[PDB]
Amino acid sequence: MKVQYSFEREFEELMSDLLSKYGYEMFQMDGLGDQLDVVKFTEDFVRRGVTNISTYFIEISKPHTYLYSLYRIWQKMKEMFGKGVADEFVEAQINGAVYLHDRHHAALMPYCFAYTLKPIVEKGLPFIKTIKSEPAKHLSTFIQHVIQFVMFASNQSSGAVGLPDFFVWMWYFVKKDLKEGIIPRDKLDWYIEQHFQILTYSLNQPIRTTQSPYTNFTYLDRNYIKAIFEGERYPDGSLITDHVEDIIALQKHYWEWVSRERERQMFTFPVLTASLLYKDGKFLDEDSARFINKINMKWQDTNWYISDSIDAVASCCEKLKGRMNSIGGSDLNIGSFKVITVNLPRIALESGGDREKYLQILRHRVQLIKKALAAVREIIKERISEGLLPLYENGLMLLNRQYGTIGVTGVWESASIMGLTTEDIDGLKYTEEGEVFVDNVLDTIREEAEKGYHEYGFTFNIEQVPAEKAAVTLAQKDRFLFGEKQPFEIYSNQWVPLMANTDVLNRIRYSGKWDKKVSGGAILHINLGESFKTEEESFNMVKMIADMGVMYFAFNTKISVCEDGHAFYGERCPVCGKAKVDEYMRIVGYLVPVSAFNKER
């Protein structure tokens, strides 16, 4: 049976011309071949047996909503910029010169946001319109509302649901219920922990599919609490800044509880970050920094965020400032509506090793990505006007607080193809001409991101993206097109590859030079041979790393699990005595089970 999809004549002509030029195999690699045949797709899915039937109904329509989104983006770009520019983008997306993230969602909903819970506390759940819900009056109903909000928001967006001020609002309800005698003192710590447990297990127990929503928590230091909440009041009229020491103590209690709970059961969410202010050789909140250094000795389960100023966060709750990162540590009231990534190894292959030629091609392709992002933003505005995205109508997601993102991947592999990498006793490194080359690539992307605000009327950022699927897909398309000239099976997501032996001093130096050029849109893994021998050792090393200008980092760890999910180190579980079956490590910046995750890439 042949079934019709109704496209304009010009788009049919383009798709036919591209099939002529590249062949059916190119379409098959991009997800637009036999995946569109519902019968073949279904009979393959049911025979692959972990997965249950709820996954089928989510996956079956993804090729069809991708095809729709690519058509709608072509239509809009043709209207804004002309037919030639539109045709150029569709060709670049199908052949792999660029990568459109969340492509099955791209003409329908936005990427991510880091939320404040103030509207939830004051107004309840106003975005659910079939019933009127009253604002919470006690701790149990506050916790219920937080869970419902996370689940709602994860089906109105493709990426992370961030909650950096969670502990600020939880403290209010703890104190209220204590003063009222709802919670007796002799039961206060029991009560707090039982709510920690309900929230945490809910965020790791998937109802549909086999994966939970992606969530983030942040430990806010005393400087951050004070700068963000100056002037603001709780619903009882008291000043939030009058309660800083109680908020700090509730944050410390959660971090201690979760470190103990991992022996009983290992889990991924929420992803943990600590945000610290550091200047001229010292931490401005030294008590919090020493605390995080102490608790991390067990599992290294928390990522370090370091900043030298709180100016950007003072004014959060026209050019946009504030940190945006897809792993964790995005500032309160900041997000991104869409990411589109440039394939850097492709440009290396096209240039023949001529660096001036490389920089010309790069500048043109970044200009193309800006016009595609502008068109996607116009489509999101349409959806808001059509009544389809209530998080925007109700003041939770804010469009004027979201960037358009220019992504990068394969920096190392690109330099390697150009002839600009080497090795010595201290491991893999860039040549002297290589460090200059990377300087020039990032400075050039930055120039164009800045010009965009005056060109298009909104703000652009740059990220070295996690690239969970793109790192594999881009390398495969390049090998299809260029053969043995492209010798890598996967591209890298850090300045030096995750599993390279590069001296710690060189690694730290490189992140010191280049994190600032992407305004904190990256992460560094520190390669420590042997575990830390003492607390003071660890702390001296943290201070060294911060001194050199690294903005976001985490220490290496390899955590074992048994078949019943207990976490430990070594080959035999100390709880039940069974052998290890897998291990948890950071592959794209957060702790995951490695065999399953690597299969999923």
Of residues 418-457, which lie at the interface with a second copy (CB under 8 A)?
Answer: none
As given in the structure block, the two tokens for residue 566 are: 């207990």
Distance from C-alpha of 44 to C-alpha of 41, rounded to nearest angstrom: 5
Measured from the CB atom, is 170 or 347 closer to a second copy?
A: 170
| Residue 211 marked in a binding site | no
| Residue 144 marked in a binding site | yes
The residue range among 134-142, 273-281, 364-372, 546-554 that interacts with a second copy, by the rule CB under 8 A, is 134-142
Q: How far is the CB of 212 from a second copy (least distance, A)?
A: 8
Measured from the CB atom, is 64 or 298 closer to a second copy?
A: 64
Distance from C-alpha of 332 to C-alpha of 316, rounded to nearest angstrom: 7
* Number of chain positions touching Zn ion (CB under 5 A): 6
Of 514-573, which residues contact a second copy (CB under 8 A)?
564-565
Please choose which of a second copy, Zn ion, none residue 565 contacts, taking the beta carbon within 5 to 8 angstroms, the exact cut-off set by kind: a second copy
When binding is defined by CB under 8 A, the residue of 31, 119, 135, 390 that contacts a second copy is 390
What does the DSSP 8-state code read for residue 450? H
Measured from the CB atom, is 264 or 485 closer to Zn ion?
A: 264
Residue (of 453, 451, 442, 457) closest to 519 by Cα position: 442
Helix axes of 244-261 and 166-180: crossing angle, nearest 10 degrees: 100
| Residue 525 marked in a binding site | no
Q: How far from 241 is each of 57, 173, 223, 284, 308, CA to CA, in Å?
A: 48, 16, 11, 17, 22
Please choose which of Zn ion, a second copy, none residue 238 contacts, taking the beta carbon within 5 to 8 angstroms, the exact cut-off set by kind: none
First to last CA, the chain: 34
| Residue 92 marked in a binding site | no
Please say whether the beta carbons of 288 and 219 come within 8 A: yes
393 is a site residue for Zn ion (CB under 5 A): no
Residue (of 117, 44, 105) closest to 73 by Cα position: 105
| Residue 579 marked in a binding site | no
Measured from the CB atom, is 435 or 468 closer to a second copy?
A: 468
Burial, 489: exposed, middle or buried (Cβ in 10 Å; 0-12, 13-18, 19+)? exposed
The residue range among 63-71, 280-288, 414-422, 498-506 that interacts with a second copy, by the rule CB under 8 A, is 63-71
Distance from C-alpha of 597 to C-alpha of 284, rounded to nearest angstrom: 38
Please choose which of a second copy, Zn ion, none residue 562 contacts, taking the beta carbon within 5 to 8 angstroms, the exact cut-off set by kind: Zn ion
Q: How far is the CB of 208 from a second copy (least distance, A)?
A: 5
When binding is defined by CB under 8 A, the residue of 20, 129, 260, 356 that contacts a second copy is 129
When binding is defined by CB under 5 A, the residue of 104, 323, 429, 566 that contacts Zn ion is 566
Measured from the CB atom, is 264 or 469 closer to Zn ion?
A: 264
Q: How far from 252 is each of 91, 158, 219, 305, 579, CA to CA, in Å?
A: 52, 31, 8, 17, 33
| Residue 562 marked in a binding site | yes
Measured from the CB atom, is 129 or 185 closer to Zn ion?
A: 129
Distance from C-alpha of 163 to C-alpha of 145, rounded to nearest angstrom: 13
| Residue 141 marked in a binding site | yes
Distance from C-alpha of 20 to C-alpha of 18, rounded to nearest angstrom: 5
Measured from the CB atom, is 52 or 501 closer to a second copy?
A: 52
Measured from the CB atom, is 47 or 533 closer to a second copy?
A: 47
Pairing assessment for the beta strands 559-561 and 567-568 based on DSSP bridges:
antiparallel
As given in the structure block, the two tokens for residue 148 are: 């419902």
Q: Which residues have a Cβ under 8 Å from the Cβ of 30 and sit 6 or more positions away?
A: 93, 94, 96, 477
| Residue 448 marked in a binding site | no
When binding is defined by CB under 8 A, the residue of 17, 23, 44, 54 that contacts a second copy is 54
Distance from C-alpha of 138 to C-alpha of 522, rounded to nearest angstrom: 39
Please choose which of a second copy, Zn ion, none residue 363 contacts, taking the beta carbon within 5 to 8 angstroms, the exact cut-off set by kind: none
Q: Which residues have a Cβ under 8 Å from the Cβ of 554 and sit 6 or more positions away?
A: 300, 302, 303, 304, 523, 524, 525, 526, 586, 589
28 is a site residue for a second copy (CB under 8 A): no
Q: How far is the CB of 509 from a second copy (least distance, A)?
A: 40
394 is a site residue for a second copy (CB under 8 A): no
Measured from the CB atom, is 119 or 135 closer to Zn ion?
A: 135
| Residue 467 marked in a binding site | yes
Please choose which of Zn ion, a second copy, none residue 573 contacts, taking the beta carbon within 5 to 8 angstroms, the exact cut-off set by kind: Zn ion
202 is a site residue for a second copy (CB under 8 A): yes
Of 236-265, which residues contact a second copy (CB under 8 A)?
265
As given in the structure block, the two tokens for residue 508 are: 């730290």
- In the block, tokens 């991009």 appear at 30
* Number of chain positions touching a second copy (CB under 8 A): 76
| Residue 415 marked in a binding site | no
Please choose which of Zn ion, a second copy, none residue 108 contacts, taking the beta carbon within 5 to 8 angstroms, the exact cut-off set by kind: a second copy
Phi, psi at 530, each rounded to 5°: 70, 150
Please enumerate, by residue number, every residue annotated as part of a binding site for Zn(2+). 562, 566, 573, 576
List, as residue ranges, the binding site for dATP: 134, 137-138, 141, 144-145, 190, 194, 197-198, 201-202
Binding site for Zn ion (CB under 5 A): 562, 564, 566, 573, 575-576
